[PDB]
Every structure is written in C-alpha cells, then in structure tokens.
Amino acid sequence: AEEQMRLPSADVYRFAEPDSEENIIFEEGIPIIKAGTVIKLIERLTYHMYADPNFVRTFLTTYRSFCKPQELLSLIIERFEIPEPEPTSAELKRFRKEYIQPVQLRVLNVCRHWVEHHFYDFERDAYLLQRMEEFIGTVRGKAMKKWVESITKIIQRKKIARDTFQSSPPTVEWHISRPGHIETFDLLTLHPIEIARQLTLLESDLYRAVQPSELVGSVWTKEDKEINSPNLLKMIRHTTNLTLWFEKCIVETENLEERVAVVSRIIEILQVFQELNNFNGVLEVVSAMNSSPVYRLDHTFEQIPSRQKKILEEAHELSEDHYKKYLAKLRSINPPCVPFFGIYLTNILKTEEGNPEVLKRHGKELINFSKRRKVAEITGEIQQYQNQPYCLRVESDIKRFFENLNPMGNSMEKEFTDYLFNKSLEIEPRNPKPLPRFPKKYSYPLKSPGVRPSN
Numbered sequence: 060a061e062e063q064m065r066l067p068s069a070d071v072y073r074f075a076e077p078d079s080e081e082n083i084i085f086e087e088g089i090p091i092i093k094a095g096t097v098i099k100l101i102e103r104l105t106y107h108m109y110a111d112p113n114f115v116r117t118f119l120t121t122y123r124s125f126c127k128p129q130e131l132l133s134l135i136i137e138r139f140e141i142p143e144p145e146p147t148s149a150e151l152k153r154f155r156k157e158y159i160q161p162v163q164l165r166v167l168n169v170c171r172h173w174v175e176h177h178f179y180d181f182e183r184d185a186y187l188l189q190r191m192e193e194f195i196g197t198v199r200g201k202a203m204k205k206w207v208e209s210i211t212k213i214i215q216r217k218k219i220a221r222d223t224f225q226s227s228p229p230t231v232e233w234h235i236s237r238p239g240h241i242e243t244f245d246l247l248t249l250h251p252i253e254i255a256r257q258l259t260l261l262e263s264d265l266y267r268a269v270q271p272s273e274l275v276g277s278v279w280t281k282e283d284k285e286i287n288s289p290n291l292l293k294m295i296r297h298t299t300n301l302t303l304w305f306e307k308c309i310v311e312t313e314n315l316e317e318r319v320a321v322v323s324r325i326i327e328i329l330q331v332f333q334e335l336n337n338f339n340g341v342l343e344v345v346s347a348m349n350s351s352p353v354y355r356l357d358h359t360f361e362q363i364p365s366r367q368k369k370i371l372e373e374a375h376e377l378s379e380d381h382y383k384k385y386l387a388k389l390r391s392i393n394p395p396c397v398p399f400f401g402i403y404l405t406n407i408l409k410t411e412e413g414n415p416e417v418l419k420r421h422g423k424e425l426i427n428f429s430k431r432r433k434v435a436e437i438t439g440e441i442q443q444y445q446n447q448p449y450c451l452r453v454e455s456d457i458k459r460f461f462e463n464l465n466p467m468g469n470s471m472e473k474e475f476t477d478y479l480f481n482k483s484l485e486i487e488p489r490n491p492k493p494l495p496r497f498p499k500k501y502s503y504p505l506k507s508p509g510v511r512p513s514n
C-alpha cells in the first residue's frame with residue numbers, strides 16, 4: 060500500500076500504526092470508538108480525515124480516568140510533531156497539505172477545547188499551563204496563526220476570570236424572627252415558604268457548580284477528592300447536613316406535641332419545594348422522614364393531618380420502581396427546577412462498578428472508552444438542567460444560616476446517627492414500655508403561618 064508508505068515510519072512516529080483488532084475496537088458515517096490503546100485514542104482524537112466534536116468533548120471530559128493531564132499534553136505534542144519524509148517536491152507538498160496540516164489543526168482544536176471547557180486542570184497544575192503556553196508559543200504557518208491567537212485569547216480570559224431578574228420576584232416572607240435577628244433563626248421561627256425558597260436558591264447554585272469531570276472514574280471517593288471534586292462534595296455535604304439537621308430538630312424535640320409541630324413544618328417545607336420543583340429538596344425531606352430515628356415515631360405521625368401524610372407518602376412514591384414517577388415528573392415540567400442529584404451518583408457508581416476498566420484482546424490491554432462515554436452521557440443529563448435561574452430574591456442572613464448548618468457538631472457521622480436513634484428510643488420507647496411525657500422546649504407559638512404567600 061502506497062498510502063501507508065506516504066505516512067511516516069514506525070521507528071520515527073507512533074501515531075501512524077496500522078489499525079487492527081490488537082489496538083482499537085469500534086462500536087456496532089463516523090465510527091464510534093468502543094476501546095483502544097491510549098496511542099490510538101490520541102490518533103482518533105486528532106484524525107486527519109474528519110472532525111469528531113462528539114469524541115473531543117467526551118475524551119476531554121473523561122480522560123483523567125485513564126491518563127494524567129501531564130501525559131495527555133505530551134502525547135498531543137508528540138502527535139503534532141509529524142516528521143517529513145526524506146527527499147528524492149511533489150510528495151512533500153501533498154503530505155504537508157493532506158496529512159500534517161489537518162492533524163496539526165486538529166491538535167490545536169483539542170487545545171482550544173481543553174482550555175475553554177477544562178481550564179481547571181491548568182489551575183490545579185501550574186507547570187501544565189507553562190508547557191501549554193510554551194507549545195502554543197513555538198509554532199509557524201499561515202493557518203495556525205488564527206488558532207494560536209484564539210487559544211491565547213481564551214487563556215488570558217481564564218487568567219482574568221480568577222479575580223438580574225427577568226420578572227419581579229415575590230416579597231421575602233418572615234414569621235417570628237425579625238429581619239436582622241439572626242440569633243433567633245431556627246426551623247420554626249423562620250417562615251417555611253422562605254426556608255424553602257432560600258434552600259432552593261442555595262441548592263440550585265450548588266447543582267449548577269458541579270462539572271462533569273468531578274463525577275468520572277469515582278474520583279470523589281479517592282485520595283485527591285477535595286481537589287478533583289470540590290463542588291460535588293459541597294453538594295453531597297449540604298444534603299448530608301440538611302437531612303441530619305431535620306432529623307436533629309425532630310428527635311431533640313422531646314415533647315410530643317412540639318415534635319408534631321416540627322414534623323408538620325418540615326412537611327410544609329417539602330410542599331413548597333414541590334411548588335418550586337426542587338426535587339433535591341423534596342427527596343432530602345423524604346430521606347429524613349424515612350431515617351431510622353424518625354420513621355419509627357408512630358406517636359408523632361399519628362397526630363400529623365391526613366393531607367400532610369398523603370403529601371409525604373406521594374413524595375416517597377417518586378423513588379419507587381427505580382425512580383419511575385420521579386423521572387416522568389422531571390421530563391414533564393418547565394423550568395426552573397433543581398433535579399434530584401443522588402440518582403446521578405447512584406447510576407454513575409453502577410456504571411463504574413458494572414463495567415471493566417480495560418478489554419482483553421490477544422494479551423494486550425485496550426482502554427474501555429464505551430464505559431467513559433456512558434458516564435459522560437449521565438453527566439450530560441446533569442448539564443441540561445444547569446441553566447435554570449429562579450425568580451427569587453436572595454436573603455443573605457437566611458442563606459448564611461443554612462450554609463453554616465453543622466448538626467453533627469464535632470461528632471463523626473456514625474456516632475451522631477447512633478445518638479439520633481438512641482434519642483428516638485428515649486422520646487418514644489419500644490413496646491411494651493410506657494410513653495413518658497417531656498417538658499416543652501419552645502417559648503414561642505407553634506402554629507405555622509402556612510404556605511400561601513402574601514397577595
């Protein structure tokens with residue numbers, strides 16, 4: 060074959076090897092890559108024949124699961140440095156025009172996407188950014204000039220990046236605690252509507268901050284979780300803290316009648332979450348009512364009105380049969396919404412545990428890229444809900460109060476959840492032990508203002 064001899068030799072260039080079942084596999088137009096060696100992945104990422112924006116996006120989202128950022132940069136620079144063949148210039152003019160120029164453009168296309176959509180890599184590693192500017196500095200040619208500028212214009216935008224409502228939002232609601240009196244802020248003293256509004260604004264912001272790479276390769280459960288998954292972990296910790304705070308509010312209210320009022324208020328909070336389509340919020344309340352300390356409180360739930368029970372039961376049924384009702388509800392509503400985040404983590408963990416890192420062919424390891432695309436498709440679903448701002452006014456004091464929630468204190472999670480359950484046994488002992496009475500802890504009126512706003 061003359062076309063293969065037009066390409067460089069194997070002893071001078073590693074990205075012009077023949078394709079086979081020993082180095083690359085395609086899935087069942089543009090071929091979609093099932094698996095392959097890292098060399099073949101870089102080859103197809105910068106393929107001369109066509110543009111592959113789907114593969115570029117998916118590669119750059121997921122590559123950290125099989126290749127370090129330092130390795131990737133080296134490999135795309137090695138790819139870029141295509142050696143010219145020796146002289147006998149008709150062959151050299153075709154080779155430059157039809158192979159070198161396309162591949163070199165495709166490498167810079169990868170660099171542009173890398174810096175525009177995954178600049179955080181270059182924030183985490185300073186030397187990585189120096190190398191990229193070193194490489195983008197030392198270039199040539201008329202066609203590259205535009206790409207070399209566009210890349211360096213994006214880099215300086217991200218250096219600078221380091222350092223309004225459409226309609227009229229509704230009036231902020233208050234109840235017992237007056238505006239400013241932050242010492243009196245609590246579950247029953249703030250207004251339930253406003254608790255729900257401020258948590259939704261907070262959770263919306265945390266949902267939108269999560270980047271796809273934070274979820275790939277289960278990196279949030281590894282040694283470098285705090286650097287690789289800062290927004291993700293912030294979102295999980297909020298959910299952990301809000302859930303355990305609801306549970307703490309209920310079981311530390313030892314008086315039965317006061318505890319009924321606490322539980323009823325949390326169900327009211329959930330009602331406003333569903334008015335707002337904050338599903339994350341709905342399912343935090345559901346998680347709290349189903350926890351071991353709360354779910355067993357039969358005396359408490361006996362006094363909760365039937366309509367409130369029904370609402371809480373209907374919320375639970377969102378999760379039944381692999382979240383069927385939830386998923387039908389989510390696709391049917393209009394913006395704005397906060398999707399339930401927990402399901403995405405569950406399904407990514409099933410993809411990660413359920414598929415192998417590599418595929419065996421003839422004793423050689425090919426990286427399983429279909430595994431990465433599946434994970435990226437799940438992060439794609441996350442992204443489609445990330446541009447949905449709420450027409451709701453921030454209240455900084457209430458925001459700050461829920462931002463600084465720390466129900467566990469200085470306790471570990473297990474010992475705190477053991478405490479909560481032991482507290483549940485104290486306030487409502489198991490049969491046949493009699494139910495003791497406990498004195499009231501609240502000096503203020505327990506009647507809720509309700510969930511209809513003003514006007």
Ligand SMILES: COc1cc2nc(C)nc(N[C@H](C)c3ccc(-c4cnc5n4CCC5)s3)c2cc1OC
Binds near residue numbers: 345356368375
């Ligand atoms: C399959 O088991 C469950 C079935 C469940 N079915 C339904 C319809 N809703 C569940 N959860 C919601 C969030 C509820 C929590 C508390 C609720 C309640 C209302 N009245 C009483 N309770 C418990 C003591 C007496 S309802 C389920 C939770 C389940 O596991 C925790």
